[PDB]
Design a protein around this ligand. Structure first.
Ligand SMILES: COc1cccc(Oc2ccc3c(CC(=O)O)coc3c2)c1
Length: 188
């Protein structure tokens, strides 16, 4: 078969009941995740191959970056709560991995301020229980699949993308294979 379990994807031994349709995990510390966002634009190319309105979910993880990694999961919860993911993803990636100007929770806040989020608005969200709940959600989703590495994408809580089984000589061909595999899995 053109798509087969163990090749472009694997099948979770313990399916996760009631998981998002398309669930992506990343870390702002993760070098491949940097490539996935700035160079390959995986999330956008998956979205363009799914039916309009389909829910794509992207969550941050704690297991990279120690203390600052946990701060970044909370800041991503702030980003999701405020709807400003598209405003802070690039400057957070570049702050952690390119310029290395993000060394504290205050430096993370600076990124939001520079992106136009008001300080009182950021601080109110940071300390809110809605954000605490969004942190819990991100952690639970990762725990549900015993997540030990990123980037990762899961489809319907049953299938995990396997990008190691794809040619990488051409960046554009790899992206479309990835997105076509998500589409195929979403139609299973
Ligand atoms: C410029 O960046 C690119 C572009 C195209 C292909 C490519 O190849 C990859 C991408 C991600 C991963 C992972 C994910 C992990 O396990 O961290 C494992 O092997 C990988 C191989 C990298």
């Amino acid at each position: 078969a053109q798509y087969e379990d163990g090749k472009q994807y694997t099948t979770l031994e313990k399916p996760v009941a009631g998981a998002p349709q398309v669930l992506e995990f990343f870390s702002f510390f993760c070098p491949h995740c940097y490539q996935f966002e700035e160079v390959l634009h995986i999330s956008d190319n998956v979205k363009k191959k799914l039916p309009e309105g389909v829910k794509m979910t992207k969550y941050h993880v704690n297991f990279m970056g120690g203390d600052l990694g946990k701060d970044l999961t909370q800041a991503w919860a702030v980003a999701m709560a405020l709807g400003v993911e598209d405003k802070v993803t690039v400057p957070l990636f570049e702050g952690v991995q390119k310029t290395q100007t993000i060394r504290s929770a205050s430096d993370i806040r600076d990124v939001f301020i520079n992106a136009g989020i008001k300080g009182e608005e950021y601080d109110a969200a940071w300390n809110s229980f809605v954000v605490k709940s969004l942190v819990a959600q991100q952690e639970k989703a990762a725990a549900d699949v015993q997540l030990r590495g990123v980037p990762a994408m899961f489809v319907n809580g049953k299938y995990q993308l396997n990008p190691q089984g794809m040619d990488t000589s051409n960046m554009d061909v790899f992206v479309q294979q990835y997105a076509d595999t998500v589409k195929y899995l979403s139609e299973k």
